[PDB]
Design a protein around this ligand. Sequence first.
Ligand SMILES: Nc1ncnc2c1ncn2[C@@H]1O[C@H](COP(=O)(O)OP(=O)(O)NP(=O)(O)O)[C@@H](O)[C@H]1O
Ligand SMILES: Nc1ncnc2c1ncn2[C@@H]1O[C@H](COP(=O)(O)OP(=O)(O)NP(=O)(O)O)[C@@H](O)[C@H]1O
Ligand SMILES: Nc1ncnc2c1ncn2[C@@H]1O[C@H](COP(=O)(O)OP(=O)(O)NP(=O)(O)O)[C@@H](O)[C@H]1O
Ligand SMILES: [Mg+2]
Ligand SMILES: [Mg+2]
Ligand SMILES: [Mg+2]
Lengths: 518, 518, 518
Amino acid sequence: VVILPEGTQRYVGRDAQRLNILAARIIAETVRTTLGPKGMDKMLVDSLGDIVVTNDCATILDKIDLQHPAAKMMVEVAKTQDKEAGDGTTTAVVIAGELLRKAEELLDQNIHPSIITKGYALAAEKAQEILDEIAIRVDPDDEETLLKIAATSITGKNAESHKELLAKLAVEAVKQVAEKKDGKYVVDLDNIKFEKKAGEGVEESELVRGVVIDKEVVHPRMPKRVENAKIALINEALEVKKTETDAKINITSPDQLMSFLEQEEKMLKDMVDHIAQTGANVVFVQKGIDDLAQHYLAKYGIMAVRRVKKSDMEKLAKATGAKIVTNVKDLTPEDLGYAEVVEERKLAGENMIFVEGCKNPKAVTILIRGGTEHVIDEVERALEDAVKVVKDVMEDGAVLPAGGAPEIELAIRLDEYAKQVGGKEALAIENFADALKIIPKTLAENAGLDTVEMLVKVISEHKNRGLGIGIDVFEGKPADMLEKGIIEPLRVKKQAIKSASEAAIMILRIDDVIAAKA
Amino acid sequence: VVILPEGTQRYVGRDAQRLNILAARIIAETVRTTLGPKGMDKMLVDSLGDIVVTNDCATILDKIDLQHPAAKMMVEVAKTQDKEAGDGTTTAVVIAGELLRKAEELLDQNIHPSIITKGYALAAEKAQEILDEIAIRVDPDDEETLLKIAATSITGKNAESHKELLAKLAVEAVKQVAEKKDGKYVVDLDNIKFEKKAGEGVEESELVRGVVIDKEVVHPRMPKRVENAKIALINEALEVKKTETDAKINITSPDQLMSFLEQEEKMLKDMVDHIAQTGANVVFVQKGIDDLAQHYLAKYGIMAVRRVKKSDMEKLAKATGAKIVTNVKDLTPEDLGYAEVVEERKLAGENMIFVEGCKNPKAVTILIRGGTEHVIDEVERALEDAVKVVKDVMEDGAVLPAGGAPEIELAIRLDEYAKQVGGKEALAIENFADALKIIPKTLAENAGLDTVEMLVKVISEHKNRGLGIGIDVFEGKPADMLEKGIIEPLRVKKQAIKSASEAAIMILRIDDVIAAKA
Amino acid sequence: VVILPEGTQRYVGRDAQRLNILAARIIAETVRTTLGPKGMDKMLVDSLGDIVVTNDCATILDKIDLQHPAAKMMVEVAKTQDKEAGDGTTTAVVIAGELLRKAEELLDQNIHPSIITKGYALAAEKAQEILDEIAIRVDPDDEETLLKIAATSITGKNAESHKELLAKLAVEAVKQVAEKKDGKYVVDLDNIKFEKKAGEGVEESELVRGVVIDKEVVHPRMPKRVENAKIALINEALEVKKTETDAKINITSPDQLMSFLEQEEKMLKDMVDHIAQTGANVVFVQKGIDDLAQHYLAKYGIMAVRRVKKSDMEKLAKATGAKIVTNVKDLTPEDLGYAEVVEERKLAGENMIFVEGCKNPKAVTILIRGGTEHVIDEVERALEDAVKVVKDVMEDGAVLPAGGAPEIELAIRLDEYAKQVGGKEALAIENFADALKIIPKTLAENAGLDTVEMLVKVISEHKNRGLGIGIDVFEGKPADMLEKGIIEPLRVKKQAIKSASEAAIMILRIDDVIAAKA
Ligand SMILES: Nc1ncnc2c1ncn2[C@@H]1O[C@H](COP(=O)(O)OP(=O)(O)NP(=O)(O)O)[C@@H](O)[C@H]1O
Ligand SMILES: Nc1ncnc2c1ncn2[C@@H]1O[C@H](COP(=O)(O)OP(=O)(O)NP(=O)(O)O)[C@@H](O)[C@H]1O
Ligand SMILES: Nc1ncnc2c1ncn2[C@@H]1O[C@H](COP(=O)(O)OP(=O)(O)NP(=O)(O)O)[C@@H](O)[C@H]1O
Ligand SMILES: [Mg+2]
Ligand SMILES: [Mg+2]
Ligand SMILES: [Mg+2]
């Protein structure tokens, strides 16, 4: 009896489970090869022919056009991990897939999914308690640890050769814009701008304690450089203003043609004279600037830029100290900001404006250079992560060893926790624990090392030497990650397990898939 | 389990590396035949049937409709190299492709791409140190070296027959518009205009110390030639102005029909009278010029040109010393510029205006002639490179011998550097050094010389006589490029190695290619 | 000008070389994964849905539907290798592919193909002289070495589990049918029959010193088992004979209807009576046997089999000592053969005839058993190889160590030979030598070992300890293959290099490929 439209696909019971799990596993296997120091990159070409080259799991899954529903669900794991902690997007997806693979073994044994799910929930919740406890507490602004955090992040990506420079830029940027409420830091990454310009190489990238704007000085006669600049920030256009209410001039005599023309000329001139009277010698206008206004600005020796993006206006205010004024007439000297140097320079033959040497900038700019556009897009992505993990640590004065040390610590301990729980739930908890080993395993795998042996050695050494013991993919053997300065934010592991877990549990609870005809 | 949409193609591991490297190598092989004094040209015809004949690598790769993603990535190397240094766009692409070719040998040897990549990064960085060290520091404005620089880039092109003249024009143009701030020059290429008219031959090309504009004198009665011109630059249109605010005339008596008409006439006449009264005998207006105004301008014996391009207005300001005035009302004698001669002349039966004999022009024009439009376009491309390299040396102040000399030096030193690094990384540094040899090799190949023997002889002589030893494709033997005066800017090699190596490394880290169905 | 038909595709020079070499390398790369103890198998499915699962390179290349000509040429290397020596089909293909790869490096260096080809031919001729010299002369029938040769051949294939048994069977079979003319053995493999029957396991396979035939006793009343059998072999049908010349009985009286009828009965009965009178109790007839004849054979207590295959008749003759007679009338007791037992037995419910316990059989049978038809076929393939290499050693009393030891010995000596030759030819010889290393290389690769390291260690150990040092893919380290008993026939290496060198040189000579539209 026709219930569903023709074309509808339906999978139930083990079929639905097998399909969903295999799809999540394949997605995970697909990105696991990007994991770690020896992890490699992917080239993604969309339907329009646009090209993306990354190592970033979140970027990869967001780009490829996935069909299977379960595979789509995995994308959400990478996305949420990316928004919360920056790093660990590959880790969260890979663990989620392994979690599902280990669970099907129990499903094949006929253990009820509610049992597997209960076990996984207990293990995930226990894992958070363990992470909070083993986490190494540190000074939120300790520069050395911060640098280590950032450097660890910038490894296994094609800009690692400059990890020292890049890490240094990321840490300075975050600490500079970090807001200390009382004893805890808060960081708004919207205050750190990334400006990219192909040319030169990655080595030439730098941190500008101010703002770099992709704009030109509006008029040729205006100064191209201003030493101790007094910056004015106007968001209203420097043009003849018109009332909000409809209005029209009704002319009844010839002399009015000139009187109204002259009145508009005076209004334009007054605005500029007013700006000049504050002492400002540099002005950023968010809207346009009438030619007449430009001429007067130039006549006054004032450097002006029009059509400045709102977000840039805000960064300019935070960097220079100037206050954005809506109406030119409200502009006062107390509204002016400061910059050691404001100058129009060319990068790759393209004029740009630098606002540098600001006092205590609340907004900052990292100028990225590189031999090619693709290379520069990938450096920005590497910096986006570096900056997030540094932020993680400044807001959570906690870190963990890297190199799979944490997941090993969790596997050992969770396996012990399973024993105190007992029964079928214990089975699930042991599998959850075993699942966490894909990290060390894949780290070794991507490095071409014998995975079975590396595991035996690392777990054994870890049991003997403690928390910091992880895998050194370069030397191909266990090592103390803490001593090696190979660390990551506590938040990366915490969010990774939360997203991986709740998603695995959700997929494991599905025993019916009903898909309409596309 | 259908994960990716049908029609999606994917290549992984060795297959990915193999396909990406082959595509890049083929692009390099395609352009390497244009390299050097004996390099040949390409004829590119697009979908619409437009024809481009050139020796320029950037242009060639820009025009070709490339399909493969890796090939597309090779276009960026050429583009960045072009924006930053002008010359060496072919060199950068050829090195990139060879770098990849040498790397695949290590990949086939099973050496991890992470190691090859690190080795390549070490070599690239070391290469920059070496280049900075062997670079020959020169006088930023030394005419003789600047001339050798220009003449060197011009060789191997369609206009080489006239390299002497063309090198002279390029050098003179840059020197003239060059700005000294503090022992260091800065050059804005936008101040050098290229105007081209088919007719005569390339030999008739010249440098105009002012501006050449493709415009006519607006009114038949105006002077076609003005001696010691007093030039006025106005951007507002010479016409009845209207308020920004909506306005309309409400006529209530017949006398107003004439009074309002006479007021608009008076307004036009006043604008012209005001211009005349400043003493200006030549006026360039960015916008339009009303017929009545043209008439009064003609009555005053004032030559006028309308709808002048903004960039041209700016070049006129810089060359004549005139100040662009927005409103006629603000024009004054102090805004007027000077030109020994302003005249309308016909080139190949087409009217143009020459503003020549300017005092100390800050903007200049190279008038290009040629027996064909295609010839002239290519001569322009040759001049663009020449002006850029001349700029490189004035801004920087370092040159290098040419003829493959810098790359031989590099190969020789990187080989030793390899030895001090040792290990699998040294193997990669060695291959990187070997790759740099495609330059001398292709310089010889394009010349029809025996590549294997030329390389042996050049490398040997270079080890004996030093840095200046490179290949002489005319004499067909090693030679001191420095003695011959065959030099190139330091910036060319530095950028070429940076873009070539970062692109190669990036391509090398790809082990997964996923392309959607177009 | 249209010279070639539309649809025709052509590649010249570098392009032809690149395409041909790439196609041959890919093919080699496809089969190298089957090489050695850790090599795996392929499942081949044709268009008809027929399945072939094997490890045998010759079979793989034969069953796959190759398109590229260069790839098809590689098939011949495997086929010729297989026909002449049995084992080493993968080795030959893999070397040819590697040779072409190393050659392209020289082509890219602009070394003329005739020179590369010259060096390769010299290296290959030298290799044969080296193999003849280092070859270990052994006793043609030394069961000990023969057993090692067979066992070494069988490993690396499913059914290696039973290598001890299978090697034993292969050796006993060859030793038995071998004909010694004078210290020199000659073996005709057609004297060793392979009979396959699914059921039981590979372990139940056995050697029958006689013949097994897929046939039944023609008459139910005949004996199903005969102790000391006196075997008669007749190829003429036991039916009423007709003249070659057309003939027809012209009946003119009623009594002739019975007389001619009774005459044919008598002719038939006489044939049988004659067979019985010789003493024969077992009879194999190549053609048919009329029911009346069957009836009388049964009455006589004689077991008979009709429609016996010609090839089986020859095997029964050589095995039992019987002589095949054309006409029954020519049969004499001296023509009868002997078998300790001749019996019809059911295998997997199917009737078969066993002729076992023959005196000194010159034809023998290896009965293959296994739990699946596919297992059975792959076992037969393993036995075909095992039997061929045993044959190689008995005809050529010479062996070599395995584990890549031979190619390592050649690579070392050929590298020195190169220095003696010098010039560009030395470049090709050195490359030929280096190419031989893929054997040791992929042997290790398929084992998951670190290629670069294994090579360094084996070449080093080989230089210190000598000829027998190869790679022990099990212990994962260099070892003396001679001490380990891991050896191969001299003929394998000899033919491998001959076929691989001549093919490589042929492909390398191609600089123009012209293919018509199908
Ligand atoms: N020097 C190192 N040695 C060993 N392991 C390291 C090192 N640096 C980082 N790691 C580990 O490598 C993993 C990070 O790899 P990575 O490829 O960046 O993926 P991810 O962080 O999981 N996701 P994402 O960065 O968001 O794409 C973590 O498990 C780290 O602890
Ligand atoms: N007289 C000369 N003798 C020998 N080599 C020369 C000479 N003049 C130039 N070269 C070399 O030729 C190369 C420049 O060739 P060219 O065809 O202009 O390509 P490119 O500079 O690499 N790229 P592009 O200029 O951007 O099109 C450089 O490697 C020079 O060192
Ligand atoms: N125990 C062993 N240890 C190491 N190498 C071995 C061992 N046994 C055999 N070999 C080597 O493995 C190779 C044979 O592998 P195999 O997969 O049978 O391919 P092949 O003989 O080249 N061709 P085919 O005709 O398909 O069998 C030879 O180079 C042997 O010397
Ligand atoms: Mg990361
Ligand atoms: Mg050039
Ligand atoms: Mg074999």
